[PDB]
Write a protein that binds this DNA or RNA. Structure first.
Ligand SMILES: [Mn+2]
Ligand SMILES: [Mn+2]
Ligand SMILES: [Mn+2]
Ligand SMILES: [Mn+2]
Ligand SMILES: [Mn+2]
Lengths: 437, 437
RNA sequence: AAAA
């Protein structure tokens, strides 16, 4: 009959409240979720949506009481709303975790509760989830409960509490290009993996920019219409010896011919050691069926698979579960809002690690992709997520970019990490060292 | 004697401490800056850099007391540090603004100071700077003074307290392209301005894609090497069916001819009513003297000047001073770090408004520039800065991009705003309404 | 300045 209540403060970061809730839920009879009301006149949005998500993914059910605060910036109104709305019941223990919310929410929820339950029959406890060392810290108690490895969360819960829905991703066994290149994907990927393991990555991306991209990427729907692709071919042919066609035919290294000749016969860009030039009477659907998937894969997607295959090995040696804690081609939306696409996600405990991939060696483009991955991981995983960008740049540029985009949040470990071309051969070990540390 | 001390908690956002420090400085004799020490074992960085900037730009001098904390997540270590390091002098008033720092800093600094001084009939007060409605909220006096229009800050001190240095920007009177087109820039910009205010912006940017960019953009230094340009032009001529040269001569709207003819004769892209083709007598220097500056301005730099010219008069009416509170092409670095450039900066009170500009109508490029301006205003202005991205996209893409990149921080006012092609003619009022209302 |  002795009721114990846990109190959480619902800010705009639901993850710490999920973690503290997951750890302490079994020891408490009631839960008071203190959230903000929506008042446009004071520029105050509501965190009720996060409070609902916390109730849903913690299975609080009837034990949950929602307490709205009219003004989360004004002490006088916080205290008034607390006296009016805080549950007036016989509690034998009141535990406030003051991790979330505004500063004035924290001090005045703390002191209101410590005063209302000063009777020694009622034990008051205050706790705080330290984001830097992953520890639940109790007030006036040396107790330091590390929750880094004990509390776990899957990608679906993590995105759901951050208000994202329609979560889709691919597995090692459901990778899309495995279907598009039947009976050959392993041969293609092994040939590509062998080349990257042989320090041929820079040679590969150089050939991909010139002459690959100058031939197969020049217009919006170039590879969708045989006439436009043939027109693009004739224009290049006019550049004579210096044409990309000649460099493709005459200056393509053997390891790149082997990669091209691993694709299925009906989906090869080459006829022997010569660029397949479509003739007239080639249907647009015949051209697309032969070059669309092959060009799109050779145009960057191969690197998403390569890095994913290097990570999956070492992640399975650990406790990670594919689909719940890592995956490829993550996509989701907020309601009535555009979708995003994240290359690779990894969850180490309850920390999201989003990984953005590119073969580009250009500072400007890699920089923009650096901004992109930083904003995405905070949208879907909260403000303590880590962003990793894997580029084709050399060591000097990756260190430059890392310092360029570094933002200070009070921790000593970087939340934005950049890898470059020299890390491709052992990219699995590099990620494992950076993530699990 | 009769000493009144103000206490500030130094987190990773120095701006609220600067605003509270500027507002209350004249009324307090001593200032206690409570900051964190660096300890990589507990993944805790130090905010001493911000504390030093706060002492410098508030001109506290020997009235400033630095109070270091060893562990900002540990209730006990916080109190031990407070007992041993807080000034032992007799104070008649102790005012603590608890806006910054961790939640455990806020709780245990508040309750420590409250017991030490409010128990002695000494004036103890606590305040909190509301980020959403720009109000300094007092706990005991129950006051909430709006500092929105009373506290000011300049781009130099704003960037400095956020640890940025080497701050450069251009004035209206020092705009770079005013030197490239002396005696002609006004005519050039006024002709472009008249067209954009006539809703010709969409037609202009489509012409800039084709055939302008098809003709004057290609290999690096295309417009500075006559052989590169003339060979490139001969290739376009062989595509006489869909030649950009034919489209230039025959399909160019009259308002663009007026723009092209607004340039000085030696810097026109047109020879009369057709494209100027360099003869073999034209040297590399003549070609660059005629075309290089004109093309770069028409390629998008004109839009930077246009937007800046549409707001400058309205900013001066609001008593904002150029250079301090607004400017164009802001550049700065962190120590030994790459520079950034921001097209336009604006400061309303103490909120930074960073404005990124592009004539592009493509989703992906505008999206990548959206991530960029969001991060940059965060780095140089703190977590409450506003980011505006002005694009050449239609209204549907503009609304999509806002929702795509929106991030929840607790306010009802959007801090990422996107404008599109349909906003160009009235961009001065659109910005003025978004920023100051 | 709503896990500093
Ligand atoms: Mn991708
Ligand atoms: Mn990618
Ligand atoms: Mn300088
Ligand atoms: Mn620019
Ligand atoms: Mn720009």
């Amino acid at each position: 009959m002795n009721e114990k209540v846990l109190v959480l403060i619902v800010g705009t970061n639901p993850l710490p409240n999920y973690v503290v809730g997951s750890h302490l839920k079994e020891k408490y009879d009631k839960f008071v979720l203190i959230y903000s009301e929506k008042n446009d006149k004071i520029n105050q949005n509501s965190t009720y949506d996060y409070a609902k998500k916390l109730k849903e993914h913690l299975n609080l059910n009837d034990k949950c009481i929602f307490l709205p605060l009219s003004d989360v910036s004004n002490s006088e109104k916080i205290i008034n709303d607390l006296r009016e709305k805080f549950p007036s019941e016989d509690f034998v223990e009141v535990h406030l975790n003051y991790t979330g919310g505004t500063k004035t929410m924290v001090v005045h929820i703390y002191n209101f509760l410590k005063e209302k339950f000063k009777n020694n029959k009622i034990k008051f406890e205050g706790s705080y989830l330290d984001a830097r060392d992953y520890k639940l810290v109790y007030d006036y108690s040396e107790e330091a409960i590390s929750l880094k490895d004990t509390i776990k969360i899957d990608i679906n819960t993590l995105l759901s509490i951050h208000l994202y829905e329609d979560i889709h991703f691919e597995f090692y066994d459901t990778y899309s290009y495995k279907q598009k290149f039947v009976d050959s994907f392993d041969k293609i990927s092994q040939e590509i993996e062998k080349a990257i393991k042989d320090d041929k990555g820079e040679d590969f991306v150089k050939w991909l920019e010139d002459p690959f991209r100058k031939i197969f990427k020049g217009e919006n729907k170039l590879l969708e219409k045989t006439a436009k692709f043939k027109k693009h071919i004739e224009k290049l042919l006019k550049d004579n010896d210096s044409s990309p066609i000649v460099k493709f035919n005459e200056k393509t290294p053997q390891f790149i011919w082997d990669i091209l000749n691993a694709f299925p016969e009906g989906k090869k860009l080459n006829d022997g050691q010569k660029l397949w030039i479509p003739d007239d009477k080639i249907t647009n659907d015949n051209l697309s069926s032969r070059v669309k998937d092959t060009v799109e894969f050779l145009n960057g997607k191969w690197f998403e698979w390569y890095v994913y295959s290097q990570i999956k090995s070492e992640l399975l040696d650990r406790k990670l579960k594919e689909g719940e804690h890592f995956g490829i081609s993550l996509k989701a939306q907020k309601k009535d809002s555009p979708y995003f696409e994240l290359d690779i996600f990894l969850i180490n405990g309850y920390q999201l690690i989003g990984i953005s991939l590119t073969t580009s060696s250009t500072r400007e483009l890699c920089k923009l992709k650096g901004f992109e991955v930083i904003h995405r991981v905070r949208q879907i995983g909260g403000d303590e997520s880590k962003a990793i960008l894997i580029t084709g740049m050399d060591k000097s540029k990756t260190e430059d970019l890392q310092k360029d985009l570094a933002y200070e949040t009070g921790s000593t470990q970087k939340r934005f990490v950049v890898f470059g071309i020299d890390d491709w051969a052992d990219i699995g070990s590099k990620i494992c060292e950076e993530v699990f540390k």
